[PDB]
């Protein structure tokens, strides 16, 4: 399950979620973001009982990019309880992403 989230919906969709949310900050000009997209598609399904996946295009959503200090991408941020539990900057492999989630969920 993946949702596309905007500045206007971030509070509802991410901060008020009933499950942890992995936020993928991306943009069109980001090659590594495209390389990790299919991995996130798989992770979203495999972790559906544990996690919600959200995508935020940073060019279209400057408020959220500014608020969370998103400077380079890819950046992934795992939210729990309305707060950032962990941040990863730069691409990682599927196995690396699972390590990150398993430790930080």
Which CATH number does the domain housing residue 32 bear?
Answer: 3.40.30.10
Experimental method reported for this structure: X-ray
> Is 88:100 a contact under the CB 8 Å cutoff?
yes
Task: Report how far residue 43's alpha carbon sits from residue 101's, in angstroms, rounded to the nearest whole number.
Answer: 10
30 among known catalytic residues: yes
Q: Is 65 tagged catalytic?
A: no
Considering 33, 53, 56, 91, which one is annotated as catalytic?
33
Number of domains in the chain: 1
Contacts of 43 (CB under 8 A, 6+ apart): 22, 51, 53, 94, 97, 98, 101
CB distance 40 to 1 below 8 Å: no
**Which 3 state secondary structure label does DSSP give 1?**
coil
Catalytic choice (30, 54, 65, 97): 30
Sorted by sequence, the CB contacts under 8 Å of residue 44 that are 6+ apart come out as: 1, 2, 51, 53
Tell the residue number behind the tokens 């969920």, with chain if given: 105
Q: Are 77 and 61 in contact (CB under 8 A)?
A: no
Give burial (CB, 10 Å; 0-12/13-18/19+) of 26.
buried
Resolution to 1 decimal place, in Å: 1.3
Q: Residue 97: which domain range?
A: 1-105
């Amino acid at each position: 399950s993946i949702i596309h989230v905007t500045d206007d919906s971030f509070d509802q969709d991410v901060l008020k979620a009933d499950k942890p949310v992995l936020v993928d900050f991306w943009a069109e000009w980001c090659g590594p973001c495209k390389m990790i997209a299919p991995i996130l598609d798989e992770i979203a399904e495999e972790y559906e009982g544990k996690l919600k996946v959200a995508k935020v295009n940073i060019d279209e959503n400057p408020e959220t990019a500014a608020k969370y200090g998103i400077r380079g991408i890819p950046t992934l941020m795992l939210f729990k309880n309305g707060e950032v539990a962990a941040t990863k900057v730069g691409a990682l492999s599927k196995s690396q992403l699972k390590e990150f989630l398993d430790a930080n969920l």
